[PDB]
Design an enzyme around this catalytic site. Structure first.
Site, PDB file in Angstrom:
ATOM      1  N   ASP A  17       0.825  -1.203   0.000  1.00 16.41           N
ATOM      2  CA  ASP A  17       0.000   0.000   0.000  1.00 16.41           C
ATOM      3  C   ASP A  17       0.862   1.257   0.000  1.00 16.41           C
ATOM      4  OD1 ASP A  17      -1.974  -1.861   0.047  1.00 16.41           O
ATOM      5  OD2 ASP A  17      -2.944  -1.164   1.888  1.00 16.41           O
ATOM      6  N   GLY A 272       1.081  -9.873  -3.960  1.00 19.96           N
ATOM      7  CA  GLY A 272       0.431  -8.615  -3.621  1.00 19.96           C
ATOM      8  C   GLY A 272      -0.053  -7.851  -4.839  1.00 19.96           C
ATOM      9  N   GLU A 273       0.232  -6.548  -4.854  1.00 20.08           N
ATOM     10  CA  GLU A 273      -0.302  -5.638  -5.863  1.00 20.08           C
ATOM     11  C   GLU A 273       0.790  -5.038  -6.737  1.00 20.08           C
ATOM     12  OE1 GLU A 273      -3.837  -3.671  -5.651  1.00 20.08           O
ATOM     13  OE2 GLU A 273      -4.430  -5.742  -5.212  1.00 20.08           O
ATOM     14  N   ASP A 274       1.781  -4.369  -6.148  1.00 18.97           N
ATOM     15  CA  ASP A 274       2.761  -3.646  -6.952  1.00 18.97           C
ATOM     16  C   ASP A 274       3.702  -4.605  -7.673  1.00 18.97           C
ATOM     17  OD1 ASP A 274       5.697  -2.027  -6.857  1.00 18.97           O
ATOM     18  OD2 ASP A 274       3.980  -0.869  -7.573  1.00 18.97           O
TER      19      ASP A 274
HETATM   20  C1  TRH Z   1      11.409  -7.790  -2.762  1.00 19.28           C
HETATM   21  C2  TRH Z   1      11.387  -6.224  -2.814  1.00 19.28           C
HETATM   22  C3  TRH Z   1      10.084  -5.501  -2.949  1.00 19.28           C
HETATM   23  N1  TRH Z   1      10.074  -4.068  -3.001  1.00 19.28           N
HETATM   24  C4  TRH Z   1       8.785  -3.325  -3.130  1.00 19.28           C
HETATM   25  C5  TRH Z   1       7.942  -3.857  -4.296  1.00 19.28           C
HETATM   26  C6  TRH Z   1       6.506  -3.433  -3.865  1.00 19.28           C
HETATM   27  O1  TRH Z   1       6.238  -2.055  -4.335  1.00 19.28           O
HETATM   28  C7  TRH Z   1       6.513  -3.463  -2.568  1.00 19.28           C
HETATM   29  C8  TRH Z   1       5.757  -4.703  -2.080  1.00 19.28           C
HETATM   30  O2  TRH Z   1       4.394  -4.469  -2.370  1.00 19.28           O
HETATM   31  P1  TRH Z   1       3.453  -5.704  -3.033  1.00 19.28           P
HETATM   32  O3  TRH Z   1       4.071  -6.173  -4.334  1.00 19.28           O
HETATM   33  O4  TRH Z   1       2.030  -5.176  -3.313  1.00 19.28           O
HETATM   34  O5  TRH Z   1       3.401  -6.996  -1.942  1.00 19.28           O
HETATM   35  P2  TRH Z   1       3.104  -6.846  -0.353  1.00 19.28           P
HETATM   36  O6  TRH Z   1       2.794  -8.202   0.209  1.00 19.28           O
HETATM   37  O7  TRH Z   1       4.310  -6.246   0.339  1.00 19.28           O
HETATM   38  O8  TRH Z   1       1.754  -5.850  -0.111  1.00 19.28           O
HETATM   39  C9  TRH Z   1       0.551  -6.400  -0.347  1.00 19.28           C
HETATM   40  O9  TRH Z   1       0.079  -7.149   0.887  1.00 19.28           O
HETATM   41  C10 TRH Z   1      -1.264  -7.699   0.689  1.00 19.28           C
HETATM   42  C11 TRH Z   1      -1.714  -8.384   1.951  1.00 19.28           C
HETATM   43  C12 TRH Z   1      -2.273  -6.609   0.305  1.00 19.28           C
HETATM   44  O10 TRH Z   1      -3.485  -7.225  -0.030  1.00 19.28           O
HETATM   45  C13 TRH Z   1      -1.812  -5.794  -0.888  1.00 19.28           C
HETATM   46  O11 TRH Z   1      -2.696  -4.661  -1.047  1.00 19.28           O
HETATM   47  C14 TRH Z   1      -0.422  -5.300  -0.766  1.00 19.28           C
HETATM   48  O12 TRH Z   1      -0.352  -4.214   0.209  1.00 19.28           O
HETATM   49  O13 TRH Z   1       8.060  -3.557  -2.072  1.00 19.28           O
HETATM   50  C15 TRH Z   1      11.350  -3.292  -2.910  1.00 19.28           C
HETATM   51  O14 TRH Z   1      11.314  -2.068  -2.949  1.00 19.28           O
HETATM   52  N2  TRH Z   1      12.658  -4.026  -2.774  1.00 19.28           N
HETATM   53  C16 TRH Z   1      12.665  -5.464  -2.728  1.00 19.28           C
HETATM   54  O15 TRH Z   1      13.665  -6.037  -2.623  1.00 19.28           O
END
Ligand code: TRH
EC number: 2.4.1.-
Length: 385
Positions: A17, A272-274
């Site tokens: 988020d 997740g989302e991003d």
């Molecule tokens: C592995 C890695 C990820 N990232 C970033 C990528 C993403 O923008 C962010 C992680 O976000 P997401 O891909 O969405 O996965 P997430 O598990 O961290 O978040 C999600 O949790 C769920 C429970 C919710 O339903 C979703 O809405 C979402 O918030 O961290 C880095 O900056 N460096 C890294 O090494």
């Protein structure tokens, strides 16, 4: 022309988020010259996706975005032209008063979670009159029209293509992480939650004829990897060899560096989302771990995306992709689902590039958001468009 934008983010859990709202906030300031204040209730979560950030600072300007701590109690300030309530996090009381007091009341948006379900089209841009008199508009990111699109920076695919066409740029980036690909070794990134299907998949990577390199950024899934490796500690920089499988632990890197990691790999396990969308911009095969929800309501979002993503795939690849994705999300996979999918990865890669290019021609979400305010502003004064 310059409008002001308030973006409220409540880090409920994980980094998605804040990851999405930070990505949107950067794009509004850099590509559109907007004035952006990002409010976050947990600065330590933002500091890990943006290492330049200072977690103890109450206000700081990063990449043209004024990142401010969401305080308790809430310090009252004036409201911006557009207030984006991200994921129904609830705006402060006094901020909704400030929105209503303006000569031109703030455009109130609610940024929704991304979904591939068809019904989000009937709800995108829907206005909802509140009790205070202001109306709120629901903004649904989507994979088809009508919807709010997907976040994508300007020139993102042009940079990704040049990066993937340069062996030297990929080796140079992997060397900064201490990674050295072996000739013929397939590269797989692992970003997921706790998953009981992991040991079954790591066994198939171990016993495969072709070798794999498993790059695991520090995070949740690391305890499961450590349990399968029969090791007590798994730290950044550790490498363990299990026959055909090399497991290497990476640091939790900056958001843009995570993109370059996705661009290097032949298959990206995301969540997740991003990171789910960033792996699609990489134009590479991917594996999506969606966290379980009340009852099993996460099954709807998974099947909805599978129906769309597999629509252009050959029947054989689509069937193996579906069974693997369902098993990867069932908390207990299939002992042979990987053999059928691994043999089709070259063709899957080609289809993943076509999927990225076709999605890349749809207007990006930040542009539709900025265009939403323009049409809303002109309508507010009964002007033409
Ligand atoms: C592995 C890695 C990820 N990232 C970033 C990528 C993403 O923008 C962010 C992680 O976000 P997401 O891909 O969405 O996965 P997430 O598990 O961290 O978040 C999600 O949790 C769920 C429970 C919710 O339903 C979703 O809405 C979402 O918030 O961290 C880095 O900056 N460096 C890294 O090494």
């Amino acid at each position: 022309h310059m409008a002001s934008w308030d973006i409220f983010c409540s880090v409920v859990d994980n980094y998605g988020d804040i990851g999405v709202t930070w990505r949107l906030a950067r794009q509004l300031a850099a590509e559109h010259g907007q004035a952006v204040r990002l409010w976050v209730d947990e600065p330590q979560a933002f500091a890990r996706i943006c290492p330049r950030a200072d977690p103890v600072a109450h206000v700081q300007c990063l990449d043209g975005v004024e990142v401010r701590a969401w305080g308790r109690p809430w310090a009252p300030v004036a409201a911006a032209d557009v207030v984006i309530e991200a994921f129904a996090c609830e705006l402060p009381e006094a901020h909704r008063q400030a929105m209503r007091e303006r000569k031109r009341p703030s455009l109130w948006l609610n940024l929704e979670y991304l979904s591939a379900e068809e019904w989000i089209g009937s709800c995108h841009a829907l206005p909802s009159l509140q009790a205070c008199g202001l109306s709120k508009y629901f903004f649904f990111p989507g994979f088809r029209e009508p919807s709010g699109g997907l976040l994508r920076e300007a020139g993102l695919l042009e940079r990704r293509r040049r990066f993937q066409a340069s062996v030297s740029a990929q080796d140079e980036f992997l060397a900064s992480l201490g990674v050295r690909r072996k000739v013929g070794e397939r590269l797989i990134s692992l970003f997921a939650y706790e998953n009981p299907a992991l040991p079954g998949w790591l066994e198939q990577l171990r016993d495969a004829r072709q070798p794999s390199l498993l790059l695991v950024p520090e995070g949740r899934v690391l305890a499961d990897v450590a349990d399968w490796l029969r090791v007590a500690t798994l730290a950044v920089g550790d490498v363990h060899v299990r026959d055909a499988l090399r497991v290497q632990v990476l640091p939790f890197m900056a958001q843009d560096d995570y993109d370059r990691l996705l661009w290097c790999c032949d298959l990206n396990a995301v969540r997740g989302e991003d990171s789910f969308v960033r792996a699609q911009w990489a134009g590479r095969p991917l594996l999506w771990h969606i966290y379980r929800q009340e009852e099993e309501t996460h099954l709807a979002k998974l099947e909805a995306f599978l129906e769309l993503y597999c629509a252009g795939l050959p029947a054989d690849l689509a069937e193996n992709l579906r069974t693997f994705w369902l098993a990867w999300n069932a908390g207990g996979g299939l002992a042979g689902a990987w053999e059928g999918l691994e043999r089709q990865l070259p063709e899957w890669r080609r289809e993943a590039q076509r999927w990225a290019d076709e999605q890349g021609m749809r207007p990006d979400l930040a542009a539709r958001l900025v265009q939403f305010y323009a049409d809303w502003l002109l309508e507010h004064h009964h002007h033409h468009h």
